[PDB]
Structure 1
Amino acid sequence: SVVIVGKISFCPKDVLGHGTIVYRGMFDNRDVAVKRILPECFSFADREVQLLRESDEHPNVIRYFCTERQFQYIAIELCAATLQEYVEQKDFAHLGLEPITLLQQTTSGLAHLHSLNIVHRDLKPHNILISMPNAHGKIKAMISDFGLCKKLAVGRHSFSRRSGVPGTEGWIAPEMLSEDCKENPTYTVDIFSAGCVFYYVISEGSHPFGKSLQRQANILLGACSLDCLHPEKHEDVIARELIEKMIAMDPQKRPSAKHVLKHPFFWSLEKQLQFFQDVSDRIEKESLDGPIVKQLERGGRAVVKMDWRENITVPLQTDLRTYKGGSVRDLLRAMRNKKHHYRELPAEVRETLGSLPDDFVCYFTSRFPHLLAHTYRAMELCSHERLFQPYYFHE
């Protein structure tokens, strides 16, 4: 019992995970998890440890404490659970927007890794760890398991799929497996995996590519469904737009981690309302026959439901100039004015609209669940402009 190691002591009584076994222990008065690896594993351990010294500074990469006689031991930050146990054993009704936050943090950690020229290559819910609560009861997600990590030489876009063990079935990008694919895998491999993890969290446990038995088979086939994402819920429309890109079969169509972080999927209601306002300001003096406006109005009739005037509450329809009820731009101009004159807005109107800014913006997104997604895609034409830097990653 209570085996003691140089600078790390752990009792085999507490077993945490299991070919290797992990135990709860202690290092230098710190509660930490401990890793023991076989001789054949002893080589993968030196790879992992190397990279943790290199990339652990980031809050969303698991902290590495030390390695210290027949086998090899690895101490790391002690966690409350994996992302898998989190999704399986927790009522989201009580957790609020915390799941989204865990996806955001996880994305931050991946973008830290990619910026270091490190492809993870094996991201999955079992790999993502949930931290013990800090002094303020806050928790975070962290990336772990760098055994299959590869570090690309500077100026290298990809890596050989052969000579490197692929992740375990279900979360592997098609470029890793298919004999047919000529192009070599790149960083987007992790975006595909992450795309699957995004869906696994939002759906509380489903997968784009079906049940665990046929996932990898479906991945190569390109047969995926996002059944859990409703086509007329604003939150679901946004999530589908991002996840569809992340899990795309063409790796070149998948967003980079830094794109993912800029995506409306992570925007507060406040920021959503700000985007709507910056767009409306941006296009206020733009010509109707112009490119920016043309693009915003294509397929817009569907977006506003043919006549958005006929789909708002009577209090606001009464308080409404030249507004054309089929124009997305006019729907935005109205919002920009109702937001600018909210105080001067009568009480029944303000009561029906709701409080600024959260209830206000949600008054419209609830009514027009494609308006934000439509607008975000259309306004990419201005991604380069300084005004829209908070909403797009340009570089």
Structure 2
Amino acid sequence: ETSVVIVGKISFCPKDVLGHGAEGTIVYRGMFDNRDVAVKRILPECFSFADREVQLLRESDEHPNVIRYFCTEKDRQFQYIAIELCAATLQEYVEQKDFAHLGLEPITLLQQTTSGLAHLHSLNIVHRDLKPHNILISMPNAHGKIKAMISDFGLCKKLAVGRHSFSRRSGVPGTEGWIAPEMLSEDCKENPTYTVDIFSAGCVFYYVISEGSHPFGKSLQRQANILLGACSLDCLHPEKHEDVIARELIEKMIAMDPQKRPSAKHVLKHPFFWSLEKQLQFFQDVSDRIEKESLDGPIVKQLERGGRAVVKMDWRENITVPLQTDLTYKGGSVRDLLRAMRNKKHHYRELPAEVRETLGSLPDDFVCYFTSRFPHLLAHTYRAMELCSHERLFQPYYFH
């Protein structure tokens, strides 16, 4: 327990176990090329399997958010794979880190996870075992930035060219509590495909922003709840703007019907990942698009459907008194709510002093003024203006 194993360019002390894999697989902290590495040791029974994994990584385009091996070695008794030593798994990050001052970092790790996934899917690889345990969080670089990396390719499937799904077998479907329902359900009439990864990631999304919860309950009940379709996201409050949008995305990602789940590239286009500037730009593009638009036309009809709850009966009554004074719009209309936001954005410099003060700076404070008071505004408008998905001017906002 004080020895150092040396195999080619990889060395480690066996006492420094970082974790355990399946079939007698152990991961150690060791060293390579004067760097810290994690080293997976492989038993003879798994040599061919480990080789196939390495080869899949060897052949595939690299991506910053997909783990990359540093070195492989082999002696008489074992094979070894070294990867970069990371700070934490996503599980440990969620369990241990105070989110209070991390700002958007946890969200960027989900965005980075979705990019790694989109990369895999674009290579016709389905992961099938996405979970917080095997999403790895790097050490900070020179400017304090960290990144998420997908690992653990032991269950992945590279689909043949021209193949878009895989059929169910008796064997290993994933990790209990993270397995999409079409892997286990009884009356499933469609092959599993890339979207099993989106279900898992949906669960991962909620796990991160709820800091430890899971849409399908505590671990002992999860997989059973998944088959029943019994999910709950009550860590997301219906009157908080950021929560309404996260819920909007996560509900689609974990949909029981795989065909209703967005693809990874779709997910990446969602308002969840929008800056405040882009949120405001969306509101302005929408408002520009829907003026001259008829009042009984399908678009503004879609927008005003259930809009009373969105504007809170009368949005004229739910803004500060400076803006109230400086405003003849229709208070039960979301279109006119949007019209008023664009108008005041446009003439922002002409606004009286007390008004620019109550609104805040452009764009961040300005848009927060409205999203914080009307928490359903973005999500409602995002879904309503999906009628214009195809239109070129709405390309930045939806995935075509």
After the TM superposition, which of the residue ranges 72-81 and 84-93 deviates more from structure 2? Answer: 72-81
Deviation at 1:154, TM superposition (A): 1.7
Q: Distance in 2 between matches of 1:76 and 1:54?
A: 17
Match of 1:380 among 383, 386, 389: 386
Deviation at 1:163, TM superposition (A): 5.8
Kept after mapping to 2: 8 A contact 1:175/1:181:
yes
Kept after mapping to 1: 8 A contact 2:44/2:77:
no
Deviation at 1:153, TM superposition (A): 1.1
Q: Distance in 2 between matches of 1:351 and 1:60?
A: 42
Describe the superposition over 1:46-74 as per-residue Cα deviations: whole angstroms up to 9, x where unpaired: 23212222346100001211211311111
After the TM superposition, which of the residue ranges 179-188 and 118-127 deviates more from structure 2? Answer: 179-188
Kept after mapping to 2: 8 A contact 1:51/1:146:
no
Kept after mapping to 2: 8 A contact 1:56/1:64:
no
- 1:7 is aligned to 9
Deviation at 1:285, TM superposition (A): 1.8
Q: Distance in 2 between matches of 1:24 and 1:154?
A: 38
Q: Distance in 1 between matches of 2:130 and 2:356?
A: 47
CA RMSD of aligned residues (A): 1.2
Deviation at 1:181, TM superposition (A): 1.3
Deviation at 1:357, TM superposition (A): 0.9
TM-score, normalisation: structure 2: 0.96
Describe the superposition over 1:175-223 as per-residue Cα deviations: whole angstroms up to 9, x where unpaired: 1112331211000000000000000000000010011001000000000
Kept after mapping to 2: 8 A contact 1:48/1:145:
no
Deviation at 1:377, TM superposition (A): 0.2
Kept after mapping to 1: 8 A contact 2:43/2:77:
no
After the TM superposition, which of the residue ranges 286-295 and 336-345 deviates more from structure 2? Answer: 286-295
Aligned residues: 393
| Residue 337 of structure 2 is aligned to residue 331 of structure 1 | yes
After the TM superposition, which of the residue ranges 174-183 and 139-148 deviates more from structure 2? Answer: 174-183
Kept after mapping to 1: 8 A contact 2:210/2:235:
yes
Q: Distance in 1 between matches of 2:142 and 2:354?
A: 44
Q: Helix, strand or coil: the match of 2:331?
A: coil
Q: Distance in 2 between matches of 1:381 and 1:179?
A: 35
Q: Distance in 1 between matches of 2:351 and 2:49?
A: 65
Which consecutive unaligned segments of at least 5 residues does structure 1 have? none
Q: Helix, strand or coil: the match of 1:73?
A: strand
Deviation at 1:290, TM superposition (A): 1.4
Match of 1:129 among 108, 131, 136: 136
Deviation at 1:238, TM superposition (A): 0.2
Deviation at 1:13, TM superposition (A): 3.1
Counterparts in 2 of 1:218 and 1:163: CA distance versus 1, 3 Å: closer
After the TM superposition, which of the residue ranges 82-91 and 148-157 deviates more from structure 2? Answer: 148-157
Deviation at 1:40, TM superposition (A): 3.0
Kept after mapping to 2: 8 A contact 1:245/1:253:
yes
Q: Distance in 2 between matches of 1:42 and 1:319?
A: 74
Q: Helix, strand or coil: the match of 2:267?
A: helix
Kept after mapping to 2: 8 A contact 1:47/1:146:
no
Describe the superposition over 1:243-278 as per-residue Cα deviations: whole angstroms up to 9, x where unpaired: 000000000000000010000000011110110011
Which consecutive unaligned segments of at least 5 residues does structure 2 have? none
Q: Distance in 1 between matches of 2:362 and 2:376?
A: 21
Deviation at 1:338, TM superposition (A): 0.7
After the TM superposition, which of the residue ranges 334-343 and 24-33 deviates more from structure 2? Answer: 24-33
Deviation at 1:388, TM superposition (A): 0.9
Q: Helix, strand or coil: the match of 1:92?
A: coil
Describe the superposition over 1:88-147 as per-residue Cα deviations: whole angstroms up to 9, x where unpaired: 011100211100000000000000000000000000000100001112221100000000
After the TM superposition, which of the residue ranges 38-47 and 325-334 deviates more from structure 2? Answer: 38-47
After the TM superposition, which of the residue ranges 64-73 and 92-101 deviates more from structure 2? Answer: 64-73
Counterparts in 2 of 1:303 and 1:371: CA distance versus 1, 3 Å: same
Counterparts in 2 of 1:55 and 1:106: CA distance versus 1, 3 Å: farther
Deviation at 1:173, TM superposition (A): 0.2
Q: Distance in 2 between matches of 1:303 and 1:352?
A: 22
Q: Distance in 1 between matches of 2:254 and 2:353?
A: 46
| Residue 348 of structure 2 is aligned to residue 348 of structure 1 | no
